[PDB]
Amino acid sequence: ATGDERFYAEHLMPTLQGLLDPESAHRLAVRFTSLGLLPRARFQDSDMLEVRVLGHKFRNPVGIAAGFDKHGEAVDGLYKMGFGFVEIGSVTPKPQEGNPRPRVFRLPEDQAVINRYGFNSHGLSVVEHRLRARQQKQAKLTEDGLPLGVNLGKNKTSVDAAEDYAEGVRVLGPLADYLVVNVSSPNTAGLRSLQGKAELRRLLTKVLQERDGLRRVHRPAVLVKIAPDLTSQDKEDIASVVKELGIDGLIVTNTTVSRPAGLQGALRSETGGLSGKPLRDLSTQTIREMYALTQGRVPIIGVGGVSSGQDALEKIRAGASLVQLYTALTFWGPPVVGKVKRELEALLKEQGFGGVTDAIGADHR
Numbered sequence: 001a002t003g004d005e006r007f008y009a010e011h012l013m014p015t016l017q018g019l020l021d022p023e024s025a026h027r028l029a030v031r032f033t034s035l036g037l038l039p040r041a042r043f044q045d046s047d048m049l050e051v052r053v054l055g056h057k058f059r060n061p062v063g064i065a066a067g068f069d070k071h072g073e074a075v076d077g078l079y080k081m082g083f084g085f086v087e088i089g090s091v092t093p094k095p096q097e098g099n100p101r102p103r104v105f106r107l108p109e110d111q112a113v114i115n116r117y118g119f120n121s122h123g124l125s126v127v128e129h130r131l132r133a134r135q136q137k138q139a140k141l142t143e144d145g146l147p148l149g150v151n152l153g154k155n156k157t158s159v160d161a162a163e164d165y166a167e168g169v170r171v172l173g174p175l176a177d178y179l180v181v182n183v184s185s186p187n188t189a190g191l192r193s194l195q196g197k198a199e200l201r202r203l204l205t206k207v208l209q210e211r212d213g214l215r216r217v218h219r220p221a222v223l224v225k226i227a228p229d230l231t232s233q234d235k236e237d238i239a240s241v242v243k244e245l246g247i248d249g250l251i252v253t254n255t256t257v258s259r260p261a262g263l264q265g266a267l268r269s270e271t272g273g274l275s276g277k278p279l280r281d282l283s284t285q286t287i288r289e290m291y292a293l294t295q296g297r298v299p300i301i302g303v304g305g306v307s308s309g310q311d312a313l314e315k316i317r318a319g320a321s322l323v324q325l326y327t328a329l330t331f332w333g334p335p336v337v338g339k340v341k342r343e344l345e346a347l348l349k350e351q352g353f354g355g356v357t358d359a360i361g362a363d364h365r
């Protein structure tokens with residue numbers, strides 16, 4: 001356990017980073033993971049990490065965020081890594097290549113990444129068939145407390161965003177425990193303006209109509225993923241629409257187009273979304289705000305800069321029922337998953353919580 005953690009963090013990951021540009025490193029990571037070539041997680045999930053939310057049981061509250069497995073190629077390997085749930089995507093209706101390279105950048109001095117992938121996607125049809133090939137295996141995983149989420153995007157040339165998301169609901173909704181309407185990528189022109197009130201109500205109404213039209217056992221929860229860069233007005237409007245329409249949850253947050261003071265990485269002024277540690281507290285505060293605006297009645301998946309049990313528990317106490325991580329894998333590798341879970345369990349005990357559930361939103365009380 002603690003042996004693998006130090007080796008990866010101090011030797012293997014720094015060496016890989018020295019050899020491989022970040023996009024190549026990412027592709028290698030997906031390949032190894034899909035093949036199960038992993039220091040298989042020794043951490044056994046205890047009962048106090050279990051969470052019931054979004055109509056499902058989650059064996060532990062630590063998931064892999066969207067964007068690592070964009071095309072649904074490494075799902076089983078990710079459960080093997082110890083994640084309590086997996087989110088794939090973003091997936092666009094038609095295949096598209098995304099932005100020209102280079103489009104991913106490491107900021108090691110900041111434990112951050114900047115990316116401008118631009119929704120590179122194999123498309124709905126390819127991902128549909130990939131998930132169908134393991135659909136019953138996933139049904140059993142979900143029943144055993146390991147749910148699957150699918151994050152939906154829209155094509156660059158799309159004339160009608162709502163129809164792109166609707167198509168995603170129809171094609172991948174039946175294969176997902178939850179769907180994510182990603183209106184917060186900073187790398188698709190016009191996308192984030194879908195977060196405005198009039199736009200958003202129309203868009204989410206259509207999405208929910210399509211979802212409701214699926215057969216009961218194929219009917220996923222629907223969540224909205226938002227940016228950390230919203231005005232107070234934007235956040236109020238999103239909270240209002242979410243409650244009005246009965247949206248099932250929020251994912252808080254995507255990457256930031258802001259550049260917090262103090263970044264040291266040479267590549268800090270590259271265009272794209274910033275992730276990792278400089279995002280952490282901006283994300284946590286957005287969780288805190290959205291939880292209060294929704295009166296704690298709308299489940300939140302908290303994400304941004306998590307690499308320790310403390311980071312996870314801060315988001316949980318701020319209002320998150322579940323958390324996700326991605327960028328920490330860059331710097332710590334696969335052992336970071338067991339690390340976060342072990343540290344989270346220890347902190348829950350230290351602070352007198354019976355389990356994760358007791359800690360959700362605790363700062364507000």
Ligand SMILES: Cc1cc2nc3c(=O)[nH]c(=O)nc-3n(C[C@H](O)[C@H](O)[C@H](O)COP(=O)(O)O)c2cc1C
Nearest residue numbers: 065066067089090115254275276304305325326327
């Ligand atoms: C390289 C990269 C690609 C990403 N791609 C997506 C994506 O396709 N869809 C999405 O909703 N979020 C995407 N994200 C955002 C992550 O899901 C997450 O919200 C964000 O990175 C903050 O978490 P982290 O600090 O633990 O990385 C991506 C992030 C990174 C770093």
Ligand SMILES: O=C1c2ccccc2C(=O)c2c1nnn2-c1cc(F)c(-c2ccccc2F)c(F)c1
Nearest residue numbers: 022025026029032033037038104106329330333334
């Ligand atoms: O810079 C990035 C970066 C940027 C933007 C998205 C993603 C990545 C990224 O995955 C990455 C980066 N640098 N190293 N990795 C990296 C390399 C690996 F080999 C693994 C791995 C996986 C399974 C078993 C053993 C391992 F070692 C891993 F988890 C992460």
Ligand SMILES: CCCCCCCCCCCC[N+](C)(C)[O-]
Nearest residue numbers: 109110111260261277278279281
């Ligand atoms: C309030 C705005 C702050 C912007 C971002 C804050 C980053 C905090 C630094 C802790 C990260 C740890 N490390 C190794 C990456 O330096």
Ligand SMILES: O=C(O)c1cc(=O)[nH]c(=O)[nH]1
Nearest residue numbers: 117118119185187255273
């Ligand atoms: O594909 C990308 O560029 C991307 C999508 C998203 O939602 N977030 C992010 O940081 N990048």
Ligand code: NA
Nearest residue numbers: 135136138139
């Ligand atoms: Na399934």
Ligand code: NA
Nearest residue numbers: 217218219220
């Ligand atoms: Na379902």
Ligand code: NA
Nearest residue numbers: 231232233234
């Ligand atoms: Na405002």
